[PDB]
Amino acid sequence: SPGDGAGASRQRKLEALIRDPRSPINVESLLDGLNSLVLDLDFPALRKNKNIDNFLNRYEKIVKKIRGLQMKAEDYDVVKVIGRGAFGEVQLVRHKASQKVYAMKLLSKFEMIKRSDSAFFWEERDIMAFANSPWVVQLFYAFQDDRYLYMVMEYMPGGDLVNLMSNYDVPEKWAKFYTAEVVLALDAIHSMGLIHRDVKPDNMLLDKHGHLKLADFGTCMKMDETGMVHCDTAVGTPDYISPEVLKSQGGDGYYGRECDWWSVGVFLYEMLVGDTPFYADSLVGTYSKIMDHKNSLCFPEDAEISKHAKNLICAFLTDREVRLGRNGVEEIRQHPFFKNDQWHWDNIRETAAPVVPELSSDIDSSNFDDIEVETFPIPKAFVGNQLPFIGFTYYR
Numbered sequence: 001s002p003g004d005g006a007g008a009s010r011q012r013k014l015e016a017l018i019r020d021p022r023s024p025i026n027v028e029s030l031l032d033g034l035n036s037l038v039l040d041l042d043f044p045a046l047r048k049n050k051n052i053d054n055f056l057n058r059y060e061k062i063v064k065k066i067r068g069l070q071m072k073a074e075d076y077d078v079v080k081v082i083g084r085g086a087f088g089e090v091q092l093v094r095h096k097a098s099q100k101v102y103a104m105k106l107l108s109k110f111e112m113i114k115r116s117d118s119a120f121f122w123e124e125r126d127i128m129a130f131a132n133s134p135w136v137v138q139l140f141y142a143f144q145d146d147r148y149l150y151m152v153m154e155y156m157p158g159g160d161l162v163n164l165m166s167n168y169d170v171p172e173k174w175a176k177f178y179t180a181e182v183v184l185a186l187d188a189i190h191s192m193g194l195i196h197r198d199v200k201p202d203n204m205l206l207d208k209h210g211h212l213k214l215a216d217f218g219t220c221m222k223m224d225e226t227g228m229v230h231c232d233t234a235v236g237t238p239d240y241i242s243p244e245v246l247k248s249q250g251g252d253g254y255y256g257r258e259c260d261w262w263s264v265g266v267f268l269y270e271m272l273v274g275d276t277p278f279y280a281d282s283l284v285g286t287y288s289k290i291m292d293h294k295n296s297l298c299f300p301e302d303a304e305i306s307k308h309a310k311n312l313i314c315a316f317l318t319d320r321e322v323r324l325g326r327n328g329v330e331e332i333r334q335h336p337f338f339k340n341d342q343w344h345w346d347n348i349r350e351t352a353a354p355v356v357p358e359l360s361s362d363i364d365s366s367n368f369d370d371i372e373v374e375t376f377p378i379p380k381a382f383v384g385n386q387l388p389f390i391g392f393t394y395y396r
């Protein structure tokens, strides 16, 4: 009992689209689509529409069954909360079936909608899923329920560079290492056509062996064909943010990847001096000092810093037009600050890190400080609060 052939040449084009993992219409995305449509229609008021009631009668049963079968939060044991953003918490979890340990980031759907900002998490997902770089925290799974986005990542038990800097006086030998690793990480992000915009020590995590990976790509943007972005997109606390990005908040200015090299300058200063170069008691105080960097930047005479370290910091902390890294990473790598006997640029990540964490087990979270509501209103009309999250689901 065979079919008469037609729509075979479409079935091949479609199976190709569906099987591409970086395609908007893979199978997980089409399932997200049906799940989201049911969540946004199943309210008592909307169901007085016959079209909606008929559709939900036909699909609500099979959609609850599917939700049972696909990856969910209940599949993980929460060992401990190791971070709490405004977005949601980061949890040290163990997958029940495999007994493997991960970090799981929760993003509140309600918080992203309520504060008009529900598109930043796409680049985070895509960088961590597809970077395939030793310098980028790896995404294994992304899934969602009606309340949360979940991202399951490799656990980084070394903690962040904030925690390191507050536990050690960092000598130049160490500062060389971490600065070099940050420069290679950012070069990897830039090579994928992205600028970070808010590089800080909180975004720099250490792995089991004490080597650096970038996490938190919430602020990342694709460069256009010219290597620039022309936007006014909002950033948070200004301590590590470049003048050109701070100015762009006032309305569309232009910046490129050299804004990330500014941040390396601030980082290197903080490591060697013990405070950020434009620290003030208020946000507006820090903003003011950053815009006035030509005057406001000065090293304490009591900090005592090599000629080469001071030269590199000052080469980063200038206007974008003349900033070190404007002409590519090559001129950064050949800066004399990075001359050393311990590592080369080609092999740094397989040399001994300055701080190798002492871990007792696979759930040791001693390099993280301790840590111990909210909904969508029931709509009267279709508003599609689940529509922005169609295509988030991803399985390695």
Ligand SMILES: Cc1[nH]ncc1-c1cc2nc(CN3CCCC3)[nH]c(=O)c2s1
Binding pocket: 083, 085, 090, 103, 105, 137, 153, 154, 155, 156, 157, 202, 203, 205, 215, 216, 217
């Ligand atoms: C993948 C991983 N393994 N072990 C820990 C982590 C992460 C920790 C974390 N923490 C934050 C919080 N933000 C940092 C800058 C402002 C708040 N954000 C993230 O994406 C991750 S990933």
